[PDB]
Every structure is written in C-alpha cells, then in structure tokens.
PDB file of N, CA and C in Angstrom:
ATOM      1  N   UNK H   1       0.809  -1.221   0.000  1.00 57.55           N
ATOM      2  CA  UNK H   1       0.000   0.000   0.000  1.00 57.55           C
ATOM      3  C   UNK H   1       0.844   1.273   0.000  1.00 57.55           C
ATOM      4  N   UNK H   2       1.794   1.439  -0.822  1.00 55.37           N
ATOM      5  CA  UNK H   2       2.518   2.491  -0.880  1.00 55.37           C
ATOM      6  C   UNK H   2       2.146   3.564  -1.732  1.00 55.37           C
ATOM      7  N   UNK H   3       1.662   4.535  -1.292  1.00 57.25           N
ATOM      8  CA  UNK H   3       1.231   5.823  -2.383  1.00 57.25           C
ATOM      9  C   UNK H   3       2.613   7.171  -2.721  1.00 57.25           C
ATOM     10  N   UNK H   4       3.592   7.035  -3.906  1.00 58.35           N
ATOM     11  CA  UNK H   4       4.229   6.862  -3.864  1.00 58.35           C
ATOM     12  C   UNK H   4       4.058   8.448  -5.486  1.00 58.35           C
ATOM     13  N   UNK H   5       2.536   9.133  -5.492  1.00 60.85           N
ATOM     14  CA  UNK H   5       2.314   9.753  -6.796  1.00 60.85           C
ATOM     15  C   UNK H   5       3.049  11.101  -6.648  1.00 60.85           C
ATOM     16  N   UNK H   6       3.144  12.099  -5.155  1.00 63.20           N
ATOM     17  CA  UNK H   6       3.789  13.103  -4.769  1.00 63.20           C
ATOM     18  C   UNK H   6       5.327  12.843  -4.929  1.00 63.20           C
ATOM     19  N   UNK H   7       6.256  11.989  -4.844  1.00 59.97           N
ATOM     20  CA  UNK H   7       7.588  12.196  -4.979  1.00 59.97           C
ATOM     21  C   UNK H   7       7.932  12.369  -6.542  1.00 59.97           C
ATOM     22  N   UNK H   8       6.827  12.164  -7.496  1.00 61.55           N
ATOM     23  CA  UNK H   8       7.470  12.680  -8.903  1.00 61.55           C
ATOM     24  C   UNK H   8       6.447  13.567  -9.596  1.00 61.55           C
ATOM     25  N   UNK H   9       6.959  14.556 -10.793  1.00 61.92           N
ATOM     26  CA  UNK H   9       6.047  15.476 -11.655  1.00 61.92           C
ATOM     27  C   UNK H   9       5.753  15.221 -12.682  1.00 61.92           C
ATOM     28  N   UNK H  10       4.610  15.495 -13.149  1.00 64.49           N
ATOM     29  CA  UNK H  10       4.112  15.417 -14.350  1.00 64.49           C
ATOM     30  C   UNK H  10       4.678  15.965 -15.444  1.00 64.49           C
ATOM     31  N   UNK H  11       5.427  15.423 -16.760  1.00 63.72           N
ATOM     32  CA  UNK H  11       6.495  16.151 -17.481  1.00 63.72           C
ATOM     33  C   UNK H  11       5.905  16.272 -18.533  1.00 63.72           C
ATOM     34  N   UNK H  12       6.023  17.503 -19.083  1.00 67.54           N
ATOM     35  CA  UNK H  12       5.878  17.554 -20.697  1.00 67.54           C
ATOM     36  C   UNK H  12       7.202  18.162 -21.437  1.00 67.54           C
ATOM     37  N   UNK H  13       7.721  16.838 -21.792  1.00 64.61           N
ATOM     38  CA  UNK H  13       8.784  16.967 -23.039  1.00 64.61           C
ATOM     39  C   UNK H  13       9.327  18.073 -23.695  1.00 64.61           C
ATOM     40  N   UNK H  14      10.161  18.748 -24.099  1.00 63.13           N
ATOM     41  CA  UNK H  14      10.534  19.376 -24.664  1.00 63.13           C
ATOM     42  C   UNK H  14      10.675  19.415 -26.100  1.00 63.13           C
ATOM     43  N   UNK H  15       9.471  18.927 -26.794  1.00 64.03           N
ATOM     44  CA  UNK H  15      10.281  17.948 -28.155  1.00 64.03           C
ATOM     45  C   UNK H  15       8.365  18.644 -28.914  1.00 64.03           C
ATOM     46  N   UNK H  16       8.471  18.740 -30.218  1.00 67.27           N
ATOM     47  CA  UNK H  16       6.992  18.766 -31.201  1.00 67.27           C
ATOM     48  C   UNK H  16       6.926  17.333 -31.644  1.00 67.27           C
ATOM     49  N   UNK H  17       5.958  17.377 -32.228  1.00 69.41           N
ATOM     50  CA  UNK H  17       5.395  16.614 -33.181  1.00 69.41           C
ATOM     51  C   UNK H  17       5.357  16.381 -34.644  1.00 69.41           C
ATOM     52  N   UNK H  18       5.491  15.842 -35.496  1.00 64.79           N
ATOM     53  CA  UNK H  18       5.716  16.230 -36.869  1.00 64.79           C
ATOM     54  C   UNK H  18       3.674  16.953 -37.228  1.00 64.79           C
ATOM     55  N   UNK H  19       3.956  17.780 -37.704  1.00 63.82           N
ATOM     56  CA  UNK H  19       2.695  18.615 -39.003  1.00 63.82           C
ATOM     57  C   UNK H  19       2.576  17.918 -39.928  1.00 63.82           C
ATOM     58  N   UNK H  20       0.921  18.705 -40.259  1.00 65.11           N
ATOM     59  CA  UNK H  20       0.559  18.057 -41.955  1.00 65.11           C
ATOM     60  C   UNK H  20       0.429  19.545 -42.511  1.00 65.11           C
ATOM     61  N   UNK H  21       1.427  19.156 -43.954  1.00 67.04           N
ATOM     62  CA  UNK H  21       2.180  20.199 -45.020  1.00 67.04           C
ATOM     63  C   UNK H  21       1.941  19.648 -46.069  1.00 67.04           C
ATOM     64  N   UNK H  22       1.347  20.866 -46.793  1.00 65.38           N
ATOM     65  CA  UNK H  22       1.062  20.856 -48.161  1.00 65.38           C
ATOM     66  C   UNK H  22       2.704  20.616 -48.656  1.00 65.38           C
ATOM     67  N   UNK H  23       2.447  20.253 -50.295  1.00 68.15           N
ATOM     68  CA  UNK H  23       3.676  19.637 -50.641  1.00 68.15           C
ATOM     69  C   UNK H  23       4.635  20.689 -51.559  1.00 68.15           C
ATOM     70  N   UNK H  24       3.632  22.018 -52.124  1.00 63.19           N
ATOM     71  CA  UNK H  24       4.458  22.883 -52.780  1.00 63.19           C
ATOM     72  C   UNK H  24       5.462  22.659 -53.813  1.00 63.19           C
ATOM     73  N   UNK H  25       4.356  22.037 -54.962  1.00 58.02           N
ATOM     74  CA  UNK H  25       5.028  21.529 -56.215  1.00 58.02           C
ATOM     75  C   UNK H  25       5.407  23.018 -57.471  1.00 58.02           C
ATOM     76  N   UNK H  26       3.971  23.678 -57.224  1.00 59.46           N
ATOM     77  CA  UNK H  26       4.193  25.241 -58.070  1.00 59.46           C
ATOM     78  C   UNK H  26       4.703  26.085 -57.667  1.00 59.46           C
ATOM     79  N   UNK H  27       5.040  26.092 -56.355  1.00 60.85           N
ATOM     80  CA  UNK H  27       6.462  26.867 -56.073  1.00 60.85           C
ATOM     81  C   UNK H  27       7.641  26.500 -56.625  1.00 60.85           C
ATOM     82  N   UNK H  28       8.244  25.324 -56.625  1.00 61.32           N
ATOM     83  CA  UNK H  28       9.190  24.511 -56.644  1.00 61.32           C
ATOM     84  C   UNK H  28       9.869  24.271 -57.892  1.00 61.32           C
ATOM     85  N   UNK H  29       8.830  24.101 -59.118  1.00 60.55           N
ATOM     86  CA  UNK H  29       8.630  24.129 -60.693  1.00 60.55           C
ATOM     87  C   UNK H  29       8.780  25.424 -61.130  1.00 60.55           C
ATOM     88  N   UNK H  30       7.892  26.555 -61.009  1.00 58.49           N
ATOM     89  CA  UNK H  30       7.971  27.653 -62.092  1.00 58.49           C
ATOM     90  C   UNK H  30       9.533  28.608 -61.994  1.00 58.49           C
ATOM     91  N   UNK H  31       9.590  29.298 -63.213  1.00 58.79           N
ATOM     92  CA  UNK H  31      10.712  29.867 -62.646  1.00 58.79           C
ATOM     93  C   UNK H  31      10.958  30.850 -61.704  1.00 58.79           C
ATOM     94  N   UNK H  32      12.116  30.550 -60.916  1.00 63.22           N
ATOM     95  CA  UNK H  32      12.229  31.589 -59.697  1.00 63.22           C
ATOM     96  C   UNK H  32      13.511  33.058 -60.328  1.00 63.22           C
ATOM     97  N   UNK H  33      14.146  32.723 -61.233  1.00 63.18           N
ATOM     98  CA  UNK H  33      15.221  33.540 -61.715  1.00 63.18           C
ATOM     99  C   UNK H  33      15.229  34.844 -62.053  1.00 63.18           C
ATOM    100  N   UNK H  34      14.477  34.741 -63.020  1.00 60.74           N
ATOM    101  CA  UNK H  34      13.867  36.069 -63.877  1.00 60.74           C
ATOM    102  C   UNK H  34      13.920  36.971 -62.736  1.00 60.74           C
ATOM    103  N   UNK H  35      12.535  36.745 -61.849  1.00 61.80           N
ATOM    104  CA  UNK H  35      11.930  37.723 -61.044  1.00 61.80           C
ATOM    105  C   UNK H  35      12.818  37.739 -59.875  1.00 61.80           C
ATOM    106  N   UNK H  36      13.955  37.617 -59.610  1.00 58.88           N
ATOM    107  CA  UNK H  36      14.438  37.709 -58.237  1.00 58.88           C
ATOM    108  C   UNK H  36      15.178  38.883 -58.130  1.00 58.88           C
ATOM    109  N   UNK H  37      14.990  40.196 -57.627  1.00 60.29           N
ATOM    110  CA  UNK H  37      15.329  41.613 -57.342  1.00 60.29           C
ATOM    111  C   UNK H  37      15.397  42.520 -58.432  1.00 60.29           C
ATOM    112  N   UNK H  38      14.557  42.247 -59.232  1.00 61.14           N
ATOM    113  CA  UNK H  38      13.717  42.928 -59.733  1.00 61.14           C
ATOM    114  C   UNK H  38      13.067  44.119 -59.798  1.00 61.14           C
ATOM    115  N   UNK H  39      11.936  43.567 -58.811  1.00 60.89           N
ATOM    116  CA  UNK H  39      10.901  44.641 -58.431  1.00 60.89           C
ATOM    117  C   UNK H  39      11.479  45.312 -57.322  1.00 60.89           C
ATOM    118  N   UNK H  40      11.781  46.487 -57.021  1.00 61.42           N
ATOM    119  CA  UNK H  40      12.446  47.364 -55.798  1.00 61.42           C
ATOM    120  C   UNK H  40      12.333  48.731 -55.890  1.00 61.42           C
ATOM    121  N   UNK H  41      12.708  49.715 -55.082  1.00 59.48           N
ATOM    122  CA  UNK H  41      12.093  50.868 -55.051  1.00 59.48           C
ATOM    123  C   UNK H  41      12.765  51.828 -55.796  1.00 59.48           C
ATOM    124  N   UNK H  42      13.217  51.254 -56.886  1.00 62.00           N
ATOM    125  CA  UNK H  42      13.653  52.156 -58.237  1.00 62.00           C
ATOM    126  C   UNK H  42      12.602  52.363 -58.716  1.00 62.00           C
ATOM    127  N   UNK H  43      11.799  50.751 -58.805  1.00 61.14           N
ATOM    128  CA  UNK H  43      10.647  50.332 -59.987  1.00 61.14           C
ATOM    129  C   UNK H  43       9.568  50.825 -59.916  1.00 61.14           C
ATOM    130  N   UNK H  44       8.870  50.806 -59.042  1.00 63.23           N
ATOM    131  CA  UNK H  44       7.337  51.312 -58.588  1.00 63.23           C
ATOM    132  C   UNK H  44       6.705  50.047 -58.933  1.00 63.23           C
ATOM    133  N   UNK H  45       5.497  49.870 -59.132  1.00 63.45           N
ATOM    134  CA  UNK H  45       4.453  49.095 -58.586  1.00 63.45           C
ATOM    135  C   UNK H  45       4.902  47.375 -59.695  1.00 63.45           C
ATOM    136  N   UNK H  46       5.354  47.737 -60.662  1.00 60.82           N
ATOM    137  CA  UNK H  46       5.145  46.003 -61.420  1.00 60.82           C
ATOM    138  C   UNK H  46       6.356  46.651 -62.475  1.00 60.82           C
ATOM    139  N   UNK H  47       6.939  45.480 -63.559  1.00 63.35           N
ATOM    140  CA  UNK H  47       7.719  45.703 -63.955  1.00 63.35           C
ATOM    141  C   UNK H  47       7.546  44.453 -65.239  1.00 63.35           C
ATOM    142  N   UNK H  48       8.573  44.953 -66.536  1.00 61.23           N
ATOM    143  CA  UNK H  48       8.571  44.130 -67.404  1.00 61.23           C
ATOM    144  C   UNK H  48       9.925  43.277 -68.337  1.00 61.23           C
ATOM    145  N   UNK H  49       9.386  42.515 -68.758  1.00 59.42           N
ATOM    146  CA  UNK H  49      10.626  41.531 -69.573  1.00 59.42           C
ATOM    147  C   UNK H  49      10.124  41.739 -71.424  1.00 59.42           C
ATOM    148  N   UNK H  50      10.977  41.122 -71.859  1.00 63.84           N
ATOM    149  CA  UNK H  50      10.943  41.299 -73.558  1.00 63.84           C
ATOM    150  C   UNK H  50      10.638  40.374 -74.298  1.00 63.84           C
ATOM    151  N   UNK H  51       9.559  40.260 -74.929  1.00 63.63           N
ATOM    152  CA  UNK H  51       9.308  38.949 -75.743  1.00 63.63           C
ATOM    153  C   UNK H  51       9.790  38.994 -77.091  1.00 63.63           C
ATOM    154  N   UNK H  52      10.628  37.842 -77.149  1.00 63.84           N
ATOM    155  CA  UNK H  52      11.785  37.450 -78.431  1.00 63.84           C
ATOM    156  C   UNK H  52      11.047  37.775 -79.728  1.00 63.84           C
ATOM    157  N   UNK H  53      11.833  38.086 -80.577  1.00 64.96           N
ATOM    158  CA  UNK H  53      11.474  38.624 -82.320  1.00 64.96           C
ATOM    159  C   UNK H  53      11.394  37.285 -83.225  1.00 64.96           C
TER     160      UNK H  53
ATOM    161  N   UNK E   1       7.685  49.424 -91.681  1.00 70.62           N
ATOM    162  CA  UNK E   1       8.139  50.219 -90.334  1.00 70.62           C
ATOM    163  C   UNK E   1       8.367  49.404 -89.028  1.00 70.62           C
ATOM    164  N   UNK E   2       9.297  50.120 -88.561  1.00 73.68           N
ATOM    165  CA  UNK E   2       9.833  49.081 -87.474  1.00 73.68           C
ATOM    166  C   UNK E   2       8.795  49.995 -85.861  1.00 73.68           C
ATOM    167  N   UNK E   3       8.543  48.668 -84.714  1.00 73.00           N
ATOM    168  CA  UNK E   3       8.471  49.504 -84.060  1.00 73.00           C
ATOM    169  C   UNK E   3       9.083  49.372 -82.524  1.00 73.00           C
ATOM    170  N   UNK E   4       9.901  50.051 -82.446  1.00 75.56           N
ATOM    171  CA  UNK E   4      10.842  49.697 -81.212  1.00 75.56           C
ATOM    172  C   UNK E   4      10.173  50.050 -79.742  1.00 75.56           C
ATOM    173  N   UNK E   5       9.104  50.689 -79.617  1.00 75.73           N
ATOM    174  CA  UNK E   5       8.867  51.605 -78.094  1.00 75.73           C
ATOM    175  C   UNK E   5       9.198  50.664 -76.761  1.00 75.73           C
ATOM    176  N   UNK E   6       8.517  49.197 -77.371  1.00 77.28           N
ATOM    177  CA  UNK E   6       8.372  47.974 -75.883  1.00 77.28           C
ATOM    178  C   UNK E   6      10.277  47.838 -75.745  1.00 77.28           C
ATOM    179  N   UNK E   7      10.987  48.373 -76.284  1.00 77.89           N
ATOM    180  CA  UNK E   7      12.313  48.069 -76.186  1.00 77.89           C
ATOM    181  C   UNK E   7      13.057  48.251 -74.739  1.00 77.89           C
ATOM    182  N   UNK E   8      12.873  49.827 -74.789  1.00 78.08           N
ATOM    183  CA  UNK E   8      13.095  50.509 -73.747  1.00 78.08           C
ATOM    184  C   UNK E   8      11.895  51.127 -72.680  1.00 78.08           C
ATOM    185  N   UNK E   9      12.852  51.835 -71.507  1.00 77.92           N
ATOM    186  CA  UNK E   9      11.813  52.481 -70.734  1.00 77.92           C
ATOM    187  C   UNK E   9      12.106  53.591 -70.456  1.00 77.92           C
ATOM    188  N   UNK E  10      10.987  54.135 -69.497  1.00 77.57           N
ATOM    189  CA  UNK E  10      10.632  55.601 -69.112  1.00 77.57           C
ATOM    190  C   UNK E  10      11.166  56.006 -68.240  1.00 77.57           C
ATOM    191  N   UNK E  11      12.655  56.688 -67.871  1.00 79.78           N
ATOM    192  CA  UNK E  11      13.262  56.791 -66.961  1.00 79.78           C
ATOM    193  C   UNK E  11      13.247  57.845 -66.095  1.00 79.78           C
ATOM    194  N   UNK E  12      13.119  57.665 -65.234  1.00 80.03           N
ATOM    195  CA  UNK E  12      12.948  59.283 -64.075  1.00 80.03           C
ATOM    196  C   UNK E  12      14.710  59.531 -63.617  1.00 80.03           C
ATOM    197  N   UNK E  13      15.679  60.072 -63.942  1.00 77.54           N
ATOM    198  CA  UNK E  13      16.766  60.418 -63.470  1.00 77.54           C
ATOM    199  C   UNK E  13      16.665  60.499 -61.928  1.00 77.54           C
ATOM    200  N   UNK E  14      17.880  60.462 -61.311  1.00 77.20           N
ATOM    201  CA  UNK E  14      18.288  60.145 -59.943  1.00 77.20           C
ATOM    202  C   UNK E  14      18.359  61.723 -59.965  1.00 77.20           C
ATOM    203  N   UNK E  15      18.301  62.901 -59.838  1.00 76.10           N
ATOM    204  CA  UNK E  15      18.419  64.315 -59.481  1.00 76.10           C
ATOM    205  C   UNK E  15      17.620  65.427 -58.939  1.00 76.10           C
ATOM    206  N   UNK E  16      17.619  66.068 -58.471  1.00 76.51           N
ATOM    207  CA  UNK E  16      16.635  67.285 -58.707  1.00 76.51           C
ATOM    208  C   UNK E  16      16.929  68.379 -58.602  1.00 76.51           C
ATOM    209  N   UNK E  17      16.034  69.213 -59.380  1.00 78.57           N
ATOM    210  CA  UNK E  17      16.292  70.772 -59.742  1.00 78.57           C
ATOM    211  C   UNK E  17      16.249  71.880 -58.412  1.00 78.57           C
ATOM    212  N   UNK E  18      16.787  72.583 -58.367  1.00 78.07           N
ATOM    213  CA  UNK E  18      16.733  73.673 -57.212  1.00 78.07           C
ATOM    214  C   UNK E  18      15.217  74.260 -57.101  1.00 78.07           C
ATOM    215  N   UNK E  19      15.196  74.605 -56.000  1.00 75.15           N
ATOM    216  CA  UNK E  19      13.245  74.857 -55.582  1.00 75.15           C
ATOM    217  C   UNK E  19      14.110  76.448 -55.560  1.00 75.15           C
ATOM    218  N   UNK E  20      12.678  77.041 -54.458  1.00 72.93           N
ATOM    219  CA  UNK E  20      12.865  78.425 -54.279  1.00 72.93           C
ATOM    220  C   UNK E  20      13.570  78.467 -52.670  1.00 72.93           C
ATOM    221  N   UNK E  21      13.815  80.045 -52.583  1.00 71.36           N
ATOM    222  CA  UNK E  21      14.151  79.981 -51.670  1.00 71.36           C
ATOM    223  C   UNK E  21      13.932  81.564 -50.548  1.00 71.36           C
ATOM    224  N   UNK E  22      14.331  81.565 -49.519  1.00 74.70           N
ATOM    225  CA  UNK E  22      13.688  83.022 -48.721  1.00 74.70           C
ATOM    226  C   UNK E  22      14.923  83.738 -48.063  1.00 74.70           C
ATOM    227  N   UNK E  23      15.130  85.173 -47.433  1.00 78.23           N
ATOM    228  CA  UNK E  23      15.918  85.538 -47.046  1.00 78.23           C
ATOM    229  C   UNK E  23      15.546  85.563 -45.330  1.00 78.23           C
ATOM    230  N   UNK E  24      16.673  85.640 -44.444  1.00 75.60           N
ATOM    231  CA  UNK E  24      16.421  85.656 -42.837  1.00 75.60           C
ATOM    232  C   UNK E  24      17.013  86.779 -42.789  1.00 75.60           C
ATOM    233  N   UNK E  25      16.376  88.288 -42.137  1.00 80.47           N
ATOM    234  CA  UNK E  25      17.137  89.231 -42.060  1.00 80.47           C
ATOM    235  C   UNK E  25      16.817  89.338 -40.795  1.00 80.47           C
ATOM    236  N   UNK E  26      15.299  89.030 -40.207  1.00 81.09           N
ATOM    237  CA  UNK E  26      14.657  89.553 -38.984  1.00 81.09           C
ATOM    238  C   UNK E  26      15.520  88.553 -37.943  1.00 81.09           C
ATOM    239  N   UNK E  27      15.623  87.650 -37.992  1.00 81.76           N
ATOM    240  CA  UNK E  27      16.465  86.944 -36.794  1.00 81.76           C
ATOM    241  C   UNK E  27      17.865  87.246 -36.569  1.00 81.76           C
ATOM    242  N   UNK E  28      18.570  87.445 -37.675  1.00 80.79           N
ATOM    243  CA  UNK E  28      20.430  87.841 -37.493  1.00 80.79           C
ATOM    244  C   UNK E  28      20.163  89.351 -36.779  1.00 80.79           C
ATOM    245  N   UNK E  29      19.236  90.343 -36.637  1.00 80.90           N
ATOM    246  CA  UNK E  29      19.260  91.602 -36.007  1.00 80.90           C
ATOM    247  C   UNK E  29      18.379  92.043 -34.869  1.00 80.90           C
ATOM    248  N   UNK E  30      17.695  90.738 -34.053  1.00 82.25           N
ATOM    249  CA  UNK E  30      16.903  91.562 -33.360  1.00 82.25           C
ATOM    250  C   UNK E  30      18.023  90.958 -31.918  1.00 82.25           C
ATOM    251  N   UNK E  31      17.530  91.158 -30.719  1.00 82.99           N
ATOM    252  CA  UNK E  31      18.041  90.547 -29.881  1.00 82.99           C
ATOM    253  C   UNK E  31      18.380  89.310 -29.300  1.00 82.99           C
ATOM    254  N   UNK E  32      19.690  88.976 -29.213  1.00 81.74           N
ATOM    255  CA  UNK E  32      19.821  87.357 -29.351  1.00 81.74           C
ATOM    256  C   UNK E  32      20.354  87.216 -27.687  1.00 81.74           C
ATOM    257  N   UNK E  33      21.423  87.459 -27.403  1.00 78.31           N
ATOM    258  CA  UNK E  33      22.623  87.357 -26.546  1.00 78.31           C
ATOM    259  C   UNK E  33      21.562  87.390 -24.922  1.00 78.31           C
ATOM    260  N   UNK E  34      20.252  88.134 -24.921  1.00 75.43           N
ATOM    261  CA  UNK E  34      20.182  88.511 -23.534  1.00 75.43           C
ATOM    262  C   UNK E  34      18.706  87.213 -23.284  1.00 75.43           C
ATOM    263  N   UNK E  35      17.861  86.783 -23.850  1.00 74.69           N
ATOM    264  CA  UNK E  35      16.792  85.921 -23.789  1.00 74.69           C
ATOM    265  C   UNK E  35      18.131  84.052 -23.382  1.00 74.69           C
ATOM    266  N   UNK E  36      19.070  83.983 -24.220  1.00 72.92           N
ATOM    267  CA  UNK E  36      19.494  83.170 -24.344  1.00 72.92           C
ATOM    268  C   UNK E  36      19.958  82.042 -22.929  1.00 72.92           C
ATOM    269  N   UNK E  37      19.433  80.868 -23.044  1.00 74.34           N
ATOM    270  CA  UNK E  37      19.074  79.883 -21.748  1.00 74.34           C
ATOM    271  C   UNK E  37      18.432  80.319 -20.797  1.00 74.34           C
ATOM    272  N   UNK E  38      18.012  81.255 -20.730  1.00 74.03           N
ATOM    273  CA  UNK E  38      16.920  82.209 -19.492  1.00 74.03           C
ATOM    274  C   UNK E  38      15.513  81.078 -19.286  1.00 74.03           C
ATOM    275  N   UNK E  39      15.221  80.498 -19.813  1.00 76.53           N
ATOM    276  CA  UNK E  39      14.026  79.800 -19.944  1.00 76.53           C
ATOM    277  C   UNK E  39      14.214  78.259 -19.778  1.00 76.53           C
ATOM    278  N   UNK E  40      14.374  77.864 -18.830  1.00 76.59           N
ATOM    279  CA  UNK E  40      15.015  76.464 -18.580  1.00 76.59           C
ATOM    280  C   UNK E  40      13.943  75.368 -17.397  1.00 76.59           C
ATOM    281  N   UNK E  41      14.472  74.379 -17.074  1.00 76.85           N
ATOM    282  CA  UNK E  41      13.096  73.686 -16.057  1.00 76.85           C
ATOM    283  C   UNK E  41      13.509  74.510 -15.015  1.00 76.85           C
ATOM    284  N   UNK E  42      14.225  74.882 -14.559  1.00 76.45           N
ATOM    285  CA  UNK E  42      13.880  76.075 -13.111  1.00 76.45           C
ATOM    286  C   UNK E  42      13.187  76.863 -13.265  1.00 76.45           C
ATOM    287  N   UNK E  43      12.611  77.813 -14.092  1.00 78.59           N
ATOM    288  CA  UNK E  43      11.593  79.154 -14.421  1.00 78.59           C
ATOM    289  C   UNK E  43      10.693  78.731 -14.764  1.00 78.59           C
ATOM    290  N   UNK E  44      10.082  77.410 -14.931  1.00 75.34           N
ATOM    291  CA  UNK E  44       8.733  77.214 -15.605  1.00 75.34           C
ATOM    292  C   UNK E  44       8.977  78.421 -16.746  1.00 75.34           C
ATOM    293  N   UNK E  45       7.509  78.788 -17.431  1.00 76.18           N
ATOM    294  CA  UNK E  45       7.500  78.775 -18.708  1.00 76.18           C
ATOM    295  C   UNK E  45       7.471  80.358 -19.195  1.00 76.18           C
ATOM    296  N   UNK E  46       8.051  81.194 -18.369  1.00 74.00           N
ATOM    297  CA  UNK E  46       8.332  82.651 -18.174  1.00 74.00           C
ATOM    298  C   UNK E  46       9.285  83.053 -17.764  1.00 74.00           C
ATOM    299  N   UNK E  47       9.597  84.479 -17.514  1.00 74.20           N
ATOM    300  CA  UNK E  47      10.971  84.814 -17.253  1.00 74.20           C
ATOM    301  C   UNK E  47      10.756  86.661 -17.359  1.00 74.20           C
ATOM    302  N   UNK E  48      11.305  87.168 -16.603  1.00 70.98           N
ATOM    303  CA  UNK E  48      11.215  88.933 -16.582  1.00 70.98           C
ATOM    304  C   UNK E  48      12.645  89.562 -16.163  1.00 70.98           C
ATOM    305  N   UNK E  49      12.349  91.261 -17.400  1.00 70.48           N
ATOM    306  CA  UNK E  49      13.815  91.752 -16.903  1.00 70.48           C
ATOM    307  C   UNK E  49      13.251  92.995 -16.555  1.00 70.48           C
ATOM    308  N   UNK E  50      13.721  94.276 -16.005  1.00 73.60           N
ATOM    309  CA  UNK E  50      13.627  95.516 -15.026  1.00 73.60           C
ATOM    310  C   UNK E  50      13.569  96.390 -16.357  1.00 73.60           C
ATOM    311  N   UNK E  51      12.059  96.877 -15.787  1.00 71.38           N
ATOM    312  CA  UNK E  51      12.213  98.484 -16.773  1.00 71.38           C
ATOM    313  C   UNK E  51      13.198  99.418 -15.744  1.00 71.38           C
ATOM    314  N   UNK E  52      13.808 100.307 -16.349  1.00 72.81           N
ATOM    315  CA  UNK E  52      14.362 101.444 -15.669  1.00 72.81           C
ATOM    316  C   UNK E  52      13.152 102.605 -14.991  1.00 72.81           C
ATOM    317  N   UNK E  53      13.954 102.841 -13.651  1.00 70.44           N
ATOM    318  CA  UNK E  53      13.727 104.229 -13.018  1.00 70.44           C
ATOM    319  C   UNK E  53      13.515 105.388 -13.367  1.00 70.44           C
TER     320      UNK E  53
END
C-alpha cells in the first residue's frame, strides 16, 4: 500500500510533433530567376521583360 | 516600319532641380545674446527683466 504519486512530476517533453504540409510543387517548378530583385524601389508598382522577335 | 517603343523604358533620373528659396534678415538683427538659456526647467515657462527708473 505504498502511495508513492507526490515524490514525482508530471512532465511535458521538450520535443513537437511532426505537421501536416502541403507539398508545394508550383512553387518549386515555375521559374524563380527572372523575377528575383527585380521589383524594388527604383521600380514602382510592377515591372517588365521582352518577348523574343 | 519598325516599331521599337516595348524596347526601352521611361526613366525618371536620380536628381533634382533647385526649388525656391527666402531671405532671414529679422532673426540675425533683433536681440539674441540677452533671452538666451533664461528659460530652462527652473523658471517654468516665463521669465522677466527691469524696466528702468
């Protein structure tokens, strides 16, 4: 008959859990190049590229 | 006829032109030397000098 529940604490881990994540295929695919610093506060609101002859 | 416009763009130069401007005559000549630090957190928000006899 030993009640024995006061000499220890109730712990919660220091550790997460894994998430549910979308998989982010059209990020991943389109191109990222073109548009990367680009648009900035030279440009103002949108900006353009040249379509070949 | 050729038409080039989508080629290039509309550039705003990095500069600017001189504005207008005003003259200060009333402050370089009225009294400077005797108001000066007279008005500090010891005087609260006033301060007095002696009419003559």
């Amino acid at each position: 008959p030993n009640n024995l529940d006061s000499n220890v604490s109730q712990i919660v881990l220091k550790k997460f859990l894994p998430g549910f994540m979308s998989d982010l295929v059209l990020a991943k695919t389109v191109d990222r190049q073109l548009l990367a610093g680009e648009i900035n506060s030279s440009t103002g609101d949108s900006v353009s590229f040249k379509r070949p002859h």
